[PDB]
Amino acid sequence: MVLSEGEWQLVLHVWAKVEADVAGHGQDILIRLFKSHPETLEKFDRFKHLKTEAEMKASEDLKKHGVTVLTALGAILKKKGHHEAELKPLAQSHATKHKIPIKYLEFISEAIIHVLHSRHPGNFGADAQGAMNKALELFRKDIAAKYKELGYQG
Numbered sequence: 001m002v003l004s005e006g007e008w009q010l011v012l013h014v015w016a017k018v019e020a021d022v023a024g025h026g027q028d029i030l031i032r033l034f035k036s037h038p039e040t041l042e043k044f045d046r047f048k049h050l051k052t053e054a055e056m057k058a059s060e061d062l063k064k065h066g067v068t069v070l071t072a073l074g075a076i077l078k079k080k081g082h083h084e085a086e087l088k089p090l091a092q093s094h095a096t097k098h099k100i101p102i103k104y105l106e107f108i109s110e111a112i113i114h115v116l117h118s119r120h121p122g123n124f125g126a127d128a129q130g131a132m133n134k135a136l137e138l139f140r141k142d143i144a145a146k147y148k149e150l151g152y153q154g
């Protein structure tokens with residue numbers, strides 16, 4: 001699959017807004033994911049002990065990792081499809097080390113869309129959301145393909 005330049009622009013336009021507060025956006029997204037799909041929290045030995053949203057919100061480690069996740073994903077989106085090099089180490093660690101099934105990647109993609117929709121309605125209309133979805137789908141497809149090669153495919 002290939003996104004058009006116009007679709008990439010819609011993605012990068014709203015992502016520019018995200019970069020105005022990466023830490024805050026990362027917190028929102030991770031907490032949305034952990035509440036909507038609590039099982040995902042089990043993958044984090046560091047965050048497993050977090051019982052409530054208030055605890056998640058007060059966690060400095062959770063916030064720091066949100067910045068790390070969004071910065072990594074941001075670097076991928078800005079590649080506009082030419083993200084092979086950025087995908088290699090990401091797929092290896094998530095397949096071999098953490099063992100993250102594709103299903104969970106669909107879950108966070110879901111969390112990303114939800115948060116952008118709430119915080120940036122003016123820059124996330126139906127067209128922008130469609131473009132963001134295509135970008136995240138392309139990401140999941142390439143990650144999945146890489147998973148297979150590494151002998152995983154979750």
Ligand code: HEM
Pocket residue numbers: 040041043044045046068069070072073089090093094098100104105108109
């Ligand atoms: C959608 C984008 C995602 C991106 C871009 C991403 C990115 C990252 C990055 C950059 C790290 C740092 C070093 C490493 O590779 O281990 C990391 C760590 C990790 N990721 Fe993700 N990740 C994503 C989704 C997920 C999902 C869905 C799960 C789990 C439900 C997950 C679980 C983990 C775990 C367990 C670690 C290590 C935590 C620790 O430091 O102990 N990742 N991720």
